[PDB]
């Protein structure tokens, strides 16, 4: 066993190992391992992403034009998100623009993905470390109204429908046949809320579990179809045609209506369900306010999103700020270049992949991905690893780092900022947020503030809806109907040899795709995901990535049951299969 | 009443089969769950983790054994000795031939699971491989597409619960039903196919007519699916409705071939 | 002056003479003029439909195969159910027994007409005589929340919700364009509500204009499209098919799984929000459990409908019971022979067609329609009338009669009889009824009873269609598929002389169509229909029918404030395109 | 800001245009009539009747005299001196022409107000006239269809308010959005009309399979309406999709061309 230093944290694998794996409620897969101490307290933490595809290597040699389709596969779960980044790239290296609806339609299936992808995470992934469900049993349907109505102006709150969402759940229980209840955390000291905060809760996860899929429509209409829309470089394929014969055939009136309808709902379900709900978790938990931290108040990376003028991702049309914080020293953010070869780099020596040198991080036009499965002594065998050896290589997941610094990114990171940079909308919703729970603002830097940060951005991204479809609509009036650029869609008219970068903030952080183009066909394709960020092992200076970090110096009330580190982790909301890809 | 035990593994895999599923708009998600079927294992849904959700696998696969459906959304990697794809330390082949095992019959769900998908594609650097080429003792049904449409599959779970037998499938595997006739034998843009009324360049007038994709690339005549019927998202639309072509996505081996903006070569 | 006596009432049209033409908030073309007295009391009622198309003359000579479409437009509120009628006269006509599906779809298809019609009548056509939509505003919605909670288990209940749905209507009347609200009733001393149950009734009204479009989905199903779906002459177009290649062409699992998830819906929006209002309705309005009796303590009639053995119209198949009661003698519930002569007939004394002898009555099978517009000696002139003249023609209605006998159609008779026949849901089901409004059983005979009595139809309506979809599927589950008899459809196959009788319950009441068909075309097509029993003109005997009956001896409080003559029509649902078609 | 006002009468109908009008998905009808017009006047749905309602008509057309939309569903009978339709005891046409002679620009809802409909076919008793044979000095909007579909109601009310300007129409008056192609030209069927595969009779193999409706007497090649893109009830289906041929009901005299199961005889 061995300690050393990194971060401000004590790196020590004395003691008890616990293995959590499979991790659940998560995409994808992935393995965490911990050491705790005799008080019961991490000391060590390894993040090891489970999964590997290959996507870069399967890219090589396809036509640019269909990369946007590969690379959507990277993940259903933030379907959409890897194919802007992909059409970016693309019209970045071939130095296409494209019509100003096309990019305000771009930026609609963004938000429209934020509300869905952050609603289910809320419920559906992260709800059960927060609620317990088998305690809803207990509570007492007339209370359950009174807290509900309490929170919220939401209409459906009465004494008969929590009674009905409770029998239905006593029947489900009754014969036995728990289904992905069975075997839960139930009891544990951790879960704080009263017997009517978990019927509400639970009533609510079902509400989320039917309204989230009207949500997606919006990419149906645009798109085709979700998950997995359908997109263009130079654009986007849904002609528009409101008042000409053939309408019938192309985003018409109706189709806008039934657009309009969709985001009212979307707005609607977001502010009266999912933020109150995510408020009282704070309210009923707020010692999680000080656990978690990582490295939330020492390293942060956004690189923006959201451009509102068509074709310009600056610091002007980002309506999504980006920057990066260092050290700690939130009064200078940094601004990002991801051309910049000392800037974004990714490690292999602690990830199972080969590099002609270990011990250097490249940039990702300079990316490999050559894929080396050894885990050198793993206390049981290449195929039953019964304790990964974190020494070594440990991991399907690269290690990136921004100027050699491990970073966080994802709601949390893009809030501090937003706020840093002075944004006045963010300063007042956190300054207002933290006052009604009647904390510190350092309690945002923690697992209860990533997710409290993720529900605020459901609203933004709600509200950004109504403003995008708004300049949809503007044009149209103003008889600008242009979806697409075709001036270079065919081969014969890009360069010879050429390259670029896409890059947005997915739902769970900074996401950027480096392309290059040679012939006609992609000669490299390297991804650097959010959660490549966030699940990072170590890299040559044994500094630990986020989720590392997080879990660090966490208290466990009973060791077998890892309610603490699934609390933790998931409030990154991991995506695994993201990660890897 | 006792609802029919459901083990649903993932191997390799995006996730857009359980997001599909989920969306489905009748029966909803939820009723299936809560009403029509008892889901007793999934990774992604489930409470339990770690250790608590490997008991939960091993209580019901033994409990039982020979009565419980296996749904599988993704595929295998055989490259590495398997170690692709981790579960509880162990290749993720592993976990599939025990769950197979003891399952009275298979749903393979996507095409992941039915044929490969993108992982699968050129050059299959993890050589994922589809769930009929390693299980092939148990009764397998076909549900491709990435993914399929949502009602598709909810209409596929209500027909076994409701009928109690596995649906009738074609010389593939896949349900006659929702896979028996091609994409563009329903689709409503044939009226140009046949009159050579063509979208020739992205929102040309002819887009802006809702004219026919073939020059654009779309796969519809060699595609079975039902997605010019059925639609997608509660009816909402489909590829070729919003614009753009089928890129093929429930036929096997779809990824490679060629561009999904060259034409098709040979139709039926 | 004149005076007479019938039916136990004094006819006289003495003193001031009060017109209301339109009458609006019913379908169609209705005029009502009556007498009241120098106590404000009506001692005559005069019932007038003002619109006539002339189906059973467009009819002659058309395919038989065709007449459901041209039957289907006599009405788009009752859509479907003159379509039923028209296939069934057909077949009958012809000897064609369909298969079970096709009937068992046709039971879906009529259940759920009455599920939408039932339930937009009392919110959008009656409930403005009841809700006093602008005494809403001054609700206090927290009372609001708690008056809905008492009554109903539905969850849109929450104090907040009330405040929006008030807010709403706030802003609605501050510009001053009150719309459908102006020049209202509002304040009227027979408005009972207290200002809360104004707001819970208003929200409802609003909750059930937007529900009502997805209960007609099933009609859009196997019907192809709402309103005006399709059908056929020897079962349904809708073809079946759930396990075979080209399902996507048919009706298949997945459509059948779009029905269920709408019979589910539509029960518990009927159940949990139609009801309890209804029942609402009546606590605060039991005085009018004596209002608006007319023909409804004396002669009720029902043909029946939804056969539940195919092809059999006996009184072992009906689910819906049909008989007749005259003189009140409910002890003798007498059988309906839709082919005697001496059973239906009607008259036109009193209306606007030719008779060759207008003092008696003719069978349908030998009905005549040959327009004739003389109203006579009117007040003004032939093309502006100040006054109709009851005694001489009066209306585009034609008379019909039971054995001479004028009766009373729709929920409340089909209650009264199947009640005196012993249907032991019914009886249960009007006991329940009456014993929470502490009413008697002679309560329901009434303005407020038709109100009640609708109400629980759509109940029974909704639950039968599940019985319905559960038949189906039973005969999916058994390979029974078929929805058509074709051996019949060629009209080289038909009798060359044949006639026959297509009846059933529509939403108003007793419908009936009688075809004959000579030479492979219509040779006669006649209707009577609900309405035109209800609205009725006299007969050579000066017999009322039951709307001027239950208009009789009613009290008004504002002789120009036409509410309690408003709330008496509507509780009979007039169709008038369907009255005289 | 005021909603701009709309008077909504009706002539001879059935009220199946009214129906629709409240089927609308999206904007609801709720919404069309809370926020985006002013509906002044309808007998269908308001409160007051006879005097007060009259009272009403006189006032909104009188106040907003040249401002108001008249939306206008059924038709005048000019038979009897028009006394086959009384409203206040005079001739529905007087209330026509006086409601028309102020409204800046008119709707004629359905197959009714457009060109006839059920009461016009032969022998037309009551010698009901469609609206642009009465009224010929005010601009008119035909939306035929018996009735027309509610989404494409609620898209043209949404077009008008939003861009603050009548549809393009074609020669016909048709908004060219929703009826400048037929229903045969976007038919999901095409692919087996132009195959010949065909229904023969109900309910036959071909029938199970959704095979074209053509030998039925599908009126849909000289149809012009949005059934077949569009859908109806929310997009559910439209009287093909469910197995009945088009009866061609947005067409003028479509009730006098023939049986319904008579084949169209000069396909376009
Ligand atoms: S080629 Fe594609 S768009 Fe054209 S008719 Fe066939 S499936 Fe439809
Ligand atoms: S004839 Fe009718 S069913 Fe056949 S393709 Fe044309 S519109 Fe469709
Ligand atoms: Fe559907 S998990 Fe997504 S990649 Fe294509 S099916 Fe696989
Ligand atoms: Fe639509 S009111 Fe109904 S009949 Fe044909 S449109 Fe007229
Ligand atoms: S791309 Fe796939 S989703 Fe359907 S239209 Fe083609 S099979
Ligand atoms: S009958 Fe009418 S509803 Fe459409 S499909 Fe034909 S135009
Ligand atoms: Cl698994
Ligand atoms: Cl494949
Ligand atoms: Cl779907
Ligand atoms: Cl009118
Ligand atoms: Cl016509
Ligand atoms: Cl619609
Ligand atoms: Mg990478
Ligand atoms: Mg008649």
């Known amino acids: ?581 | 009443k006792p609802r029919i035990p459901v083990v649903w593994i993932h191997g390799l895999e995006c996730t857009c089969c359980t997001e599909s599923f989920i969306r489905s708009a009748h029966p909803l998600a939820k009723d299936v769950i809560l009403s029509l079927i008892s889901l007793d294992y999934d990774d992604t849904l489930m409470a339990a983790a770690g250790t608590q959700a490997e008991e939960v696998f091993e209580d019901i696969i033994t409990q039982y054994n020979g009565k419980y459906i296996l749904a599988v959304e993704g595929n295998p990697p055989l490259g590495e000795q398997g170690m692709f794809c981790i579960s509880s330390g162990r290749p993720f082949i592993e976990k599939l031939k025990r769950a197979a095992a003891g399952a009275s019959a298979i749903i393979a769900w996507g095409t992941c699971a039915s044929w490969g998908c993108v992982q699968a594609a050129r050059p299959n650097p993890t050589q994922a491989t589809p769930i009929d080429k390693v299980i092939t003792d148990k009764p397998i049904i076909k549900v491709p597409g990435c993914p399929p449409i949502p009602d598709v599959m909810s209409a596929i779970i209500t027909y076994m619960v409701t009928f109690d037998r596995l649906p009738d499938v074609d010389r593939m595997g896949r349900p006659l039903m929702f896979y028996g006739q091609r994409i563009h034998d329903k689709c409503y843009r044939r009226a140009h196919f046949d009159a050579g009324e063509f979208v020739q360049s992205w929102d040309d007038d002819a887009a802006r007519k809702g004219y026919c994709l073939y020059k654009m690339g779309c796969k519809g005549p060699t595609t079975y699916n039902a997605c010019s019927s059925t639609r997608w998202n509660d009816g909402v639309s489909f590829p070729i409705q919003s614009g753009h072509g089928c890129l093929g996505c429930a036929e096997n081996g779809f990824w490679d071939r060629g561009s999904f903006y060259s034409r098709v070569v040979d139709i039926p």
């Open chain 1, 1 to 581: 066993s061995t300690q050393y230093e990194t971060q401000g944290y004590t790196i020590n694998n004395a003691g008890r190992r616990l293995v959590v794996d499979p991790i659940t409620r998560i995409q994808g897969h992935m393995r965490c391992e911990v050491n705790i101490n005799d008080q019961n307290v991490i000391t060590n933490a390894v993040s090891c992403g489970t999964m590997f595809r290959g996507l870069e290597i399967i890219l090589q040699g396809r036509d640019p034009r269909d990369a946007w389709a590969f690379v959507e596969r990277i993940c259903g779960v933030c379907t959409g998100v890897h194919a802007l980044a992909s059409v970016y790239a693309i019209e970045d290296a071939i130095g296409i623009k494209v019509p100003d609806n096309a990019n305000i339609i771009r930026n609609i299936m963004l938000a429209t993905l934020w509300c869905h992808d952050h609603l289910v995470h809320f419920y559906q992934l992260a709800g059960m470390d927060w609620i317990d469900v088998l305690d809803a049993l207990k509570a007492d349907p007339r209370k359950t109204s009174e807290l509900a109505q309490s929170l919220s102006s939401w209409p459906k709150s009465s004494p008969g429908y929590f009674f009905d969402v409770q029998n239905r759940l006593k029947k489900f229980v009754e014969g036995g046949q728990l289904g992905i209840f069975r075997n839960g955390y139930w009891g544990h000291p951790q879960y704080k809320l009263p017997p009517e905060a978990n019927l509400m809760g639970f009533a609510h996860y079902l509400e989320a579990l039917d309204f989230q899929r009207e949500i997606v429509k919006i990419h149906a209409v645009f798109g085709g179809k979700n998950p997995h829309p359908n997109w263009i470089v130079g654009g986007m394929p849904c002609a528009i045609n409101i008042d000409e014969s053939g309408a019938v055939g192309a985003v018409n009136m109706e189709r806008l209506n039934l657009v309009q309808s969709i985001i009212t709902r979307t707005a609607d379900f977001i502010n009266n369900v999912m933020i109150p709900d995510a408020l009282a978790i704070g309210q009923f938990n707020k010692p999680w306010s000080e656990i978690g931290t990582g490295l939330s108040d020492k390293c942060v990376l956004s690189y923006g999103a959201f451009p509102d003028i068509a074709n310009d991702f600056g610091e002007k049309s980002l309506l999504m700020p980006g920057g990066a914080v260092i050290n700690g020293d939130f009064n200078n953010v940094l601004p990002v270049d991801l051309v910049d070869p000392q800037q974004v780099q990714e490690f292999v020596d602690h990830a199972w992949y080969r590099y002609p040198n270990d011990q250097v991080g490249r940039h990702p036009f300079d990316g490999i991905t050559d894929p080396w499965y050894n885990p050198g002594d793993v206390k049981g065998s290449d195929t039953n690893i019964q304790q990964l050896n974190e020494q070594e290589r440990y991991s399907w997941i690269k290690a990136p780092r921004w100027r050699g610094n491990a970073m966080e990114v994802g709601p949390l990171a893009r809030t501090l900022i937003a706020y840093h940079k002075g944004d006045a909308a963010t300063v007042e919703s956190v300054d207002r947020m933290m006052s009604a729970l009647n904390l510190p603002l350092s309690g945002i830097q923690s697992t209860l503030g990533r997710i409290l940060c993720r529900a605020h951005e459901a609203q933004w991204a709600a509200g950004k809806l109504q403003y995008f479809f708004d300049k949809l609509m503007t044009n149209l009036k103003n008889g600008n109907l242009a979806t697409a650029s075709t001036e270079k869609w065919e081969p014969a008219t890009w360069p010879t040899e050429c390259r670029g970068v896409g890059f947005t903030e997915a739902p769970r952080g900074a996401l950027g795709h480096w392309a290059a183009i040679r012939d006609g066909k992609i000669d490299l394709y390297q991804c650097v995901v959010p959660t490549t960020w966030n699940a990072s092992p170590r890299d040559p200076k044994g500094q630990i990535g986020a989720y590392e970090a997080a879990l660090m110096n966490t208290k466990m009330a009973i060791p077998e049951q890892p309610l603490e580190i699934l609390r933790t982790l998931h409030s990154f909301d991991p995506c695994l299969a993201c990660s890897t890809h």
